[PDB]
């Protein structure tokens, strides 16, 4: 799924999904 790869690139330099 190409949705997967784009999200991979996002979280390289954005706050991780589990950090509040």
């Amino acid at each position, epitope marked *: 799924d190409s949705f*997967k790869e784009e999200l991979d*690139k996002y*979280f*390289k*330099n954005h706050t*991780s999904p589990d*950090v509040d």
Partner: antibody
Amino acid sequence: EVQLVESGAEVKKPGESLKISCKGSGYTFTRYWIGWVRQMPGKGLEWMGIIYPGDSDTRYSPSFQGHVTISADKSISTAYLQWNSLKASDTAMYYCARLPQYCSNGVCQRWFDPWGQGTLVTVSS
Amino acid sequence: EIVLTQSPSSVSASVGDRVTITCRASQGISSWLAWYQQKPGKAPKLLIYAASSLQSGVPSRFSGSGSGTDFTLTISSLQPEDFATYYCQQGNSFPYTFGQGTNLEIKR
């Protein structure tokens, strides 16, 4: 539960090759930087490098660049620490760890959670 | 590199005691200091990140504070499972570095 599982202890002679592994589960591996830390016997913690499994971008500490290679296989959610020619001074506990981050305007700050159980490496003649 | 100096190197204390450990950074790191606990043979465990944020599942008797270069970990009332070695770590800039560790042992 987020978990990192590492490979079994190794006993090697100087000059041999070695690859050790760190498998992640319970999270999306390609969405967190992964780090390696060395702890020599009876000493503290030394950061070695990090990798982003999404695209295998790596960043080494100056103290370890050249002697060790960090890589990842995102297809099996596994990161690696590899040496072409071990030295007895490599004898240590090695840990991998996930690095959650906070970022604002492209600028990111990191800490280590969770940590793998460690791989013991003994290099001797 | 940013050197982190922990003091004192060893602390002697009993169950119920209040203990404070300090971490001094050689350059300013804003608030990006973390504290770990490590027992012999075992992997480190995160207690506190971003100087004062409690890691979920860690008891509030652990609390961190400070900014800039001077940081403190405080254990308000020591429990038997708290005897261990503690490390600070800065994640503000490369290379990432750790303090040399403080050993918390049992007084008698």
